[PDB]
Design a protein around this motif. Structure first.
Motif, mmCIF file in Angstrom:
data_model
loop_
_atom_site.group_PDB
_atom_site.id
_atom_site.type_symbol
_atom_site.label_atom_id
_atom_site.label_comp_id
_atom_site.label_asym_id
_atom_site.label_seq_id
_atom_site.Cartn_x
_atom_site.Cartn_y
_atom_site.Cartn_z
ATOM 1 N N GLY A 138 11.112 3.861 42.587
ATOM 2 C CA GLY A 138 10.979 4.042 41.160
ATOM 3 C C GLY A 138 12.343 3.847 40.527
ATOM 4 N N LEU A 139 12.470 2.964 39.533
ATOM 5 C CA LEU A 139 13.629 2.941 38.664
ATOM 6 C C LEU A 139 13.197 2.631 37.244
ATOM 7 C CD1 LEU A 139 15.740 -0.273 39.241
ATOM 8 C CD2 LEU A 139 13.521 0.082 40.324
ATOM 9 N N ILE A 140 13.675 3.441 36.300
ATOM 10 C CA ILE A 140 13.140 3.516 34.970
ATOM 11 C C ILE A 140 14.338 3.547 34.019
ATOM 12 C CG2 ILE A 140 11.555 5.045 36.297
ATOM 13 C CD1 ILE A 140 12.415 6.770 33.407
ATOM 14 N N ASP A 141 14.116 3.359 32.715
ATOM 15 C CA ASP A 141 15.104 3.728 31.708
ATOM 16 C C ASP A 141 14.422 4.565 30.640
ATOM 17 O OD1 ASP A 141 16.882 3.841 29.453
ATOM 18 O OD2 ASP A 141 18.155 2.404 30.556
ATOM 19 N N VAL A 142 14.412 5.868 30.905
ATOM 20 C CA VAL A 142 14.221 6.893 29.893
ATOM 21 C C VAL A 142 15.294 7.953 30.131
ATOM 22 C CG1 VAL A 142 12.635 8.578 28.863
ATOM 23 C CG2 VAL A 142 11.748 6.388 29.625
ATOM 24 N N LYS A 143 15.886 8.427 29.031
ATOM 25 C CA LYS A 143 16.911 9.454 28.957
ATOM 26 C C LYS A 143 16.650 10.618 29.913
ATOM 27 C CE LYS A 143 17.247 7.310 24.650
ATOM 28 N NZ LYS A 143 16.328 6.827 23.597
ATOM 29 N N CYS A 144 17.437 10.714 30.987
ATOM 30 C CA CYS A 144 17.442 11.933 31.793
ATOM 31 C C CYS A 144 18.052 13.060 30.988
ATOM 32 C CB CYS A 144 18.193 11.773 33.098
ATOM 33 S SG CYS A 144 19.617 12.829 33.485
ATOM 34 N N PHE A 145 17.406 14.217 30.994
ATOM 35 C CA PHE A 145 18.093 15.457 30.678
ATOM 36 C C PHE A 145 18.585 16.118 31.972
ATOM 37 C CE2 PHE A 145 18.139 17.060 26.257
ATOM 38 C CZ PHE A 145 19.004 18.157 26.402
ATOM 39 N N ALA A 146 18.070 15.673 33.127
ATOM 40 C CA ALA A 146 18.338 16.221 34.446
ATOM 41 C C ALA A 146 17.469 15.467 35.452
ATOM 42 C CB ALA A 146 17.999 17.716 34.511
ATOM 43 N N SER A 147 17.889 15.444 36.721
ATOM 44 C CA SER A 147 17.080 14.914 37.817
ATOM 45 C C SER A 147 15.683 15.524 37.834
ATOM 46 C CB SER A 147 17.776 15.219 39.144
ATOM 47 O OG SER A 147 18.933 14.407 39.281
ATOM 48 N N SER A 148 15.586 16.823 37.558
ATOM 49 C CA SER A 148 14.327 17.531 37.572
ATOM 50 C C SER A 148 13.348 16.996 36.522
ATOM 51 C CB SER A 148 14.620 19.023 37.390
ATOM 52 O OG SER A 148 15.724 19.181 36.512
ATOM 53 N N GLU A 149 13.836 16.297 35.494
ATOM 54 C CA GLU A 149 12.952 15.675 34.523
ATOM 55 C C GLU A 149 12.266 14.471 35.167
ATOM 56 O OE1 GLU A 149 11.657 13.153 32.053
ATOM 57 O OE2 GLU A 149 10.607 15.084 32.419
ATOM 58 N N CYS A 150 13.046 13.599 35.815
ATOM 59 C CA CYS A 150 12.602 12.415 36.516
ATOM 60 C C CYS A 150 11.424 12.743 37.389
ATOM 61 C CB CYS A 150 13.667 11.925 37.485
ATOM 62 S SG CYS A 150 15.342 11.771 36.916
ATOM 63 N N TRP A 151 11.394 13.990 37.848
ATOM 64 C CA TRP A 151 10.283 14.460 38.635
ATOM 65 C C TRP A 151 9.036 14.418 37.759
ATOM 66 C CZ3 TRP A 151 12.323 19.490 41.682
ATOM 67 C CH2 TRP A 151 13.503 19.176 42.383
#
Length: 37
Positions: free
Chosen positions: A2-15
């Motif tokens: 998975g590789l995306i471009d949406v603003k991380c607020f944290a790794s835990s968001e990507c989850w």
């Protein structure tokens, strides 16, 4: 994997992000983008 471009607020968001799309919630943010495995 998975590789995306949406603003991380944290790794835990990507989850929740990867989970929203698929379910594959095992991931990590980079900078302000995000990636699942």
């Amino acid at each position: 994997f998975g590789l995306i471009d949406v603003k991380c607020f944290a790794s835990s968001e990507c989850w929740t992000a990867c989970k929203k799309v698929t379910g594959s919630g095992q991931g990590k943010c980079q900078n302000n983008q995000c990636r699942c495995y």
